[PDB]
């Protein structure tokens, strides 16, 4: 398609509207109510241009560039006098009721309305009358509400209802008294409600967790990082001021997590700012806790490790690839144990075998939205992999998208698309032990135990392909539902099967693999997605090693007299009493961690490791994509006594001091090269990000904006002399503003989006090749493995049906986005959002036990009696008791286990 903007010819896409096409060309058109992820509605009337019928036309007519397709031979003008006057008039009309609030507004300096007021050239007020006002609502602990600043652009309601699928936010009222919020005061119930702080172009919805310790955008030190709160691996921009992690912003990755994060990643960063974190190496000597610096810590640790007869290392899926590899090199490959349980490791290795050996393509997070039917087996996606649930919602709305496409309606005209596809949607079949948050859009939901969900998957795979093993004992109603699922999956051009290791069942993963293989054998374009547990679960599975139980037996038998635990609390993967006894028996325990865990009391040496905000490294997400996260700030810049290093730095220096009695720390690229050389399965992490010698025309990449302030006063209370700027020898970024952050710079890692005239998160449009697409020079991250040429065989281990045995209670896992993650519960802002710890019971089981809803019952697990209140779960199958996984005192390894003497306290 050929367009002519202000007499200049451009080649665009005819399927795009004029606004996104002109923004992709670098032209500036003001806009409020259009979003690339949400489509065009024509509400704010800000994107007006002047369209001409032909080339020799002078009058023209004001059209809206978001509502006008960028067809071939189009003639428009942006800098026309009438279009400029109308855009300034629209800004003026929006400014008639706006409060004089910019100094006391958290959106100041980050405001789209500020940028568009300046861009339209409106700086003189002639409106002399009153301004309308609105009371505010309490929207919970994460979102702060201020309705006076609203411009009625309907972005919040469109995102929250059409895109996110939420129900409790809406628009109320009339002509100029439109109110946007909840019908009553209460917490916003959506798991993706935190994206409202970037969706809203004004300061109506603001980050309250950031608003506590608020600082402006220009004062932030930003980094490109990966969110560590689950396995999806969404790209984030952590921003820091005065030595504390101030905010998490969404970093655009067109392949993974383009515009949106979930609430756990956006608000669960508060564990970094905890005051109980280790900041210096501490050595235990009797009842004394001697604080050392790094050199004598390495010397002492080297002597005690050299005096030991066998040293073992227990890793974690929390730690990066480099840190786990450094521990594995320090203790040896045969003495390296993964920090997860045997069942967790078996499920994770089976998921990895399915992903990189099953011959079925694993889609990216953005690619999930283009699938025609979704079957979720066992995995509570909204509570474990929430962004996959959001992409599943988009894939479900794909049917309305294609129905509107069949009527020659453009893909950006979202209102007509939703009008045509009223309630028709792509098939979604979710299985769980109880209700999920995807039940409102699911074609079917199966509330059953994990054995029954696995049997349903095996029956689906057998009905799709008769070479798969059959299931005997299917009820006719269950057979009818299986036939419905099979008829939906067989007629889908792009079926998608989503499972994971959080269900606590190997057979669920086997059934999902069988369904994917049966769909692949029919020639369908089937994709499979496995949801892991932690941020680097896939990387720890690829690296491999023994389980935690083998390490505990090695400690208990006396064969290992020294244990090095890397960033693992060890209570989430095994029983606490066994771990405590095995660690107390060992004469040397060294815990390398950034959080104050419970096993540090028995630890002889504690190494103050760095979190993701203070370290660089590589993490492998659930799809096998290696992603590099970069250090945000130097911990020792403010507190000069703080000795907090990277975990791989700690362990590599320890290995060097053990081998040659000299302290060499590392460079990060050396550890990357060591990983690539020693582990050929992790050889793709070299190309995840360029090395520390990468420059943009000779200069580094800036972590903080060019208008960063306070440089001669941030440390003036400690010392009036300005200290040395922190040097970054590990990566290509610099701890200063003397770098490159141009939108046209040839790079893939963007610490933050800023353009002249675009201070809001809309500068990502300037940082993309086309608006709403990918990054201009490719998205960061590289897939570790390609799709295999040949697949697996059918798993013939069909489990027997769930039999409720008397006196034993099967623990059904319940996951919560706020509470199940290990580090997110440590964030103090989560405790208001974290649920109370209950236990779920069937009505029949509660009536048999004589217990009501809310009464306290006590159960003993591994000789430990604990009491919890009771809810009555209607969808939970009898013979099962429902436990919330990852909570205080409930380890995630309890999923799929059994319970004894569960009785009323």
């Amino acid at each position: 398609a050929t367009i002519h903007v202000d007499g200049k010819e451009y080649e665009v896409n005819g399927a795009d509207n004029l606004l996104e096409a002109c923004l992709s060309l670098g032209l500036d058109i003001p806009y409020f109510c259009w979003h690339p992820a949400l489509g065009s509605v024509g509400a704010c009337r800000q994107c007006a241009v002047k369209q001409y019928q032909n080339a020799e036309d002078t009058r023209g007519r004001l059209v809206m560039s978001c509502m006008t397709p960028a067809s071939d031979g189009t003639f428009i003008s942006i800098d026309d006098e009438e279009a400029k006057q109308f855009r300034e008039s629209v800004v003026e009309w929006l400014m008639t009721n706006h409060p004089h609030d910019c100094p006391v507004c958290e959106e100041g300096g980050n405001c789209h309305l500020q940028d568009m007021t300046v861009m339209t050239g409106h700086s003189f007020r002639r409106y002399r009358f009153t301004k309308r006002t609105h009371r505010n609502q309490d929207l919970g602990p994460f979102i702060s509400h201020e309705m006076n600043r609203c411009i009625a652009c309907y972005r919040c309601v469109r995102y929250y209802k059409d895109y996110a699928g939420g129900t409790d936010l809406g628009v109320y009222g009339a002509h100029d008294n439109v109110y946007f919020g909840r019908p009553e005061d209460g917490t916003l119930e959506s798991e993706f409600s935190g994206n409202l702080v970037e969706i809203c172009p004004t300061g109506v919805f603001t980050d309250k967790t950031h608003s506590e310790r608020y600082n402006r955008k220009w004062d932030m030190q930003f980094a490109p990082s990966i969110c560590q709160q689950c396995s999806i691996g969404c790209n984030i921009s952590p921003g820091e001021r005065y030595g504390e992690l101030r905010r998490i912003e969404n970093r655009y990755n067109g392949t993974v997590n383009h515009y949106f994060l979930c609430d756990r990643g956006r608000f669960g960063y508060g564990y970094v700012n905890l005051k109980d974190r280790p900041r210096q190496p501490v050595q235990r000597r009797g009842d004394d806790f001697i604080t050392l610096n790094a050199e004598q810590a390495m010397q002492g640790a080297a002597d005690i490790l050299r005096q030991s007869k066998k040293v073992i290392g227990i890793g974690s899926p929390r730690a990066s690839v480099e840190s786990n590899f450094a521990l594995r090199e320090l203790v040896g490959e045969e003495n390296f144990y993964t920090g997860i349980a045997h069942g967790e490791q078996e499920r994770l290795q089976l998921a990895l075998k399915v992903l990189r050996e099953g011959g079925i393509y694993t889609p990216a997070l953005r690619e999930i939205e283009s699938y025609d039917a979704v079957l979720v087996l066992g995995e509570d996606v909204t509570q474990t992999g929430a962004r996959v649930a959001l992409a599943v919602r988009q894939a479900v709305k794909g049917k309305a998208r294609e129905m509107a496409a069949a009527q020659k309606v453009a893909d950006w005209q979202i209102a007509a698309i939703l009008n045509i596809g009223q309630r028709a949607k792509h098939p979604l079949f979710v299985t769980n032990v109880d209700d999920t948050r995807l039940d409102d859009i699911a074609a079917w939901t199966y509330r059953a135990p994990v054995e029954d969900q696995a049997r349903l998957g095996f029956a689906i795979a057998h009905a799709l392909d008769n070479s798969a093993p059959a299931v005997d004992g299917i009820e006719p109603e269950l057979q009818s539902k299986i036939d419905v699922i099979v008829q939906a999956l067989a007629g889908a051009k792009k079926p998608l099967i989503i499972s994971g290791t959080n269900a606590g069942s190997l057979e669920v993963i086997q059934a999902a693999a069988n369904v994917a293989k049966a769909l692949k054998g029919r020639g369908a374009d089937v994709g499979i997605t496995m949801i892991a547990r932690s941020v680097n679960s896939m990387g720890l599975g690829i690296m491999g090693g023994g389980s935690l139980e083998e390490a505990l037996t090695e400690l208990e038998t006396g064969r290992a007299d020294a244990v090095v635990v890397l960033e693992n609390d060890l209570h989430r993967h095994a029983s606490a009493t066994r771990v405590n006894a095995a660690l107390a028996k060992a004469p040397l325990v060294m815990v390398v961690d950034h959080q104050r865990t419970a096993i540090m009391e028995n630890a002889h040496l504690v190494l103050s490791a760095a979190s993701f905000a203070e370290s660089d490294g590589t993490v492998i997400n659930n799809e096998g994509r290696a992603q590099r996260f970069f250090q945000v700030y130097d911990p020792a810049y403010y507190d000069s006594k703080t000795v907090m290093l990277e975990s791989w730095r700690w362990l590599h220096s320890l290995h060097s001091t053990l081998l040659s009695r000299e302290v060499d720390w590392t460079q990060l690229d050396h550890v990357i090269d060591a990983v690539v050389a020693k582990i050929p399965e992790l050889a793709g992490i070299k190309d995840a990000a360029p090395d520390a010698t990468f420059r943009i025309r000779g200069q580094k990449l800036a972590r903080e904006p060019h208008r960063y302030s306070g440089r001669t006063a941030m440390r003036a209370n400690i010392s009036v002399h300005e200290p040395r700027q922190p040097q970054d020898i590990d990566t290509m970024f610099t701890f200063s503003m003397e770098g490159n952050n141009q939108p046209t710079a040839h790079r893939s890692q963007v610490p933050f989006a800023w353009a002249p005239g675009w201070n809001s998160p809309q500068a990502w449009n300037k940082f993309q090749d086309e608006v709403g697409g990918k990054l201009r020079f490719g998205d960061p991250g590289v897939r570790l493995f390609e799709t295999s040429e040949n697949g697996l065989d059918y798993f013939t281990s069909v489990p027997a049906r769930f039999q409720p045995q008397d006196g034993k209670w099967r623990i059904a896992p319940y996951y919560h986005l706020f509470g199940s993650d290990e580090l997110s519960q440590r964030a103090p802002v989560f405790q208001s959002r974290m649920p109370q710890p209950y236990i779920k019971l069937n009505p029949a089981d509660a009536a048999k036990l004589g217990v009501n809803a809310g009464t306290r019952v006590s159960f003993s697990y591994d000789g430990n009696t604990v009491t919890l209140p009771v809810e009555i779960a209607e969808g939970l199958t009898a013979g099962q008791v429902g436990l919330p996984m990852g909570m205080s005192g409930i380890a995630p390894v309890l999923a799929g286990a059994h319970l004894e003497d569960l009785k009323e306290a």
Binding site: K161, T167, L169, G170, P183
Partner: protein
């Protein structure tokens, strides 16, 4: 504490029988609740949402959008006087002044004993017989300020 009555619920289901989408009975469900109880209370939004299977935010937005669905308590009789252009030509301001003198309240307010609620309203489609007033179900035309307190005494 709100609970929908049996007659209200059955009328609501009979209203959703008329459409291919149960959402389309939200306006008439709110009108049924308003006719039964004078106005639409806070729990009525959640009750109508639970019956209709739509979120309560959409029901609240519909109830706050439409002027004839009252989300605040009103009196036993609602006076609605036309203030549009033809009745402005015919002099609705004398009628409004007589109403404010007799009821001792401003428009949008309720009498202290809860008998009358005075409200302006748009054109009633009776411009040839203006000015017009609309009490609860009856429209009165050819109004004069002298006939206002005589007319108001027949609504006990």
């Amino acid at each position: 504490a709100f609970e929908l009555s049996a007659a209200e619920r059955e009328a609501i289901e009979h209203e959703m029988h008329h459409y291919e989408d149960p959402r389309a009975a939200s306006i008439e469900a709110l009108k049924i609740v308003q006719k039964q109880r004078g106005w639409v209370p806070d729990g009525a939004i959640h009750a109508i949402a639970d019956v209709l299977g739509i979120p309560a935010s959409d029901v609240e937005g519909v109830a706050t959008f439409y002027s004839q669905i009252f989300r605040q308590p009103v009196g036993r009789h609602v006076i609605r006087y036309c203030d549009s252009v033809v009745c402005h030509i015919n002099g609705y301001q004398g009628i409004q002044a007589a109403l404010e003198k007799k009821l001792n309240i401003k428009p949008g307010q309720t009498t202290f004993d809860g008998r009358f609620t005075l409200l302006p309203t748009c054109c009633l489609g009776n411009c040839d017989k203006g000015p017009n007033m609309m009490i609860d179900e009856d429209t009165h035309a050819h109004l004069t300020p002298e006939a206002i307190p005589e007319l108001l005494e027949r609504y006990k």
